[PDB]
Design a protein around this ligand. Structure first.
Ligand SMILES: COc1cc(-c2ccc3c(c2)nc(CCc2ccccc2)n3CCN2CCOCC2)cccc1=O
Length: 119
């Protein structure tokens, strides 16, 4: 027999929220990731020329809360997209690039026992 696994919106929320809460918990590391990057406020005019698909924690939280996700990999893709954007835009020696690498480290430690328990 062949089939694809179905997931309820509240089932996705309860299983994936600790991994997101773990990212939020990182202070000062998560502070630049909590809200969408605002180039005008940050004095980075070329941001949208480089980062074509912006992602942040508030969007991922709003999606997971309002049931905008269907599969667990959709959540993981969004989180990795947010990390990829900060690594692409920022210098390797910069505060945001280092904070990003720390968040990715926490996320890989948190998502591993969660995705294994999901299937
Ligand atoms: C994730 O990628 C980037 C992030 C940021 C970034 C975004 C928001 C930031 C921030 C940097 N620095 C601060 C100040 C808070 C803070 C303090 C001590 C350490 C880290 C953050 N916040 C929060 C407040 N801000 C004030 C201005 O309008 C917006 C809200 C800049 C550069 C490149 C990026 O691509």
């Amino acid at each position: 027999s062949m089939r694809k696994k179905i997931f309820k919106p509240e089932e996705l929320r309860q299983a994936l929220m600790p991994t997101l809460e773990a990212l939020y918990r990182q202070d000062p590391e998560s502070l630049p990731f909590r809200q969408p990057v605002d180039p005008q406020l940050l004095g980075i005019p070329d941001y949208f020329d480089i980062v074509k698909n912006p992602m942040d924690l508030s969007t991922i939280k709003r999606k997971l809360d309002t049931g905008q996700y269907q599969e667990p990999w959709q959540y993981v893709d969004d989180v990795w997209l947010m990390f990829n954007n900060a690594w692409l835009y920022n210098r390797k020696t910069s505060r945001v690039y280092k904070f990003c690498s720390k968040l990715a480290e926490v996320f890989e430690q948190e998502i591993d026992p969660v995705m294994q328990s999901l299937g």
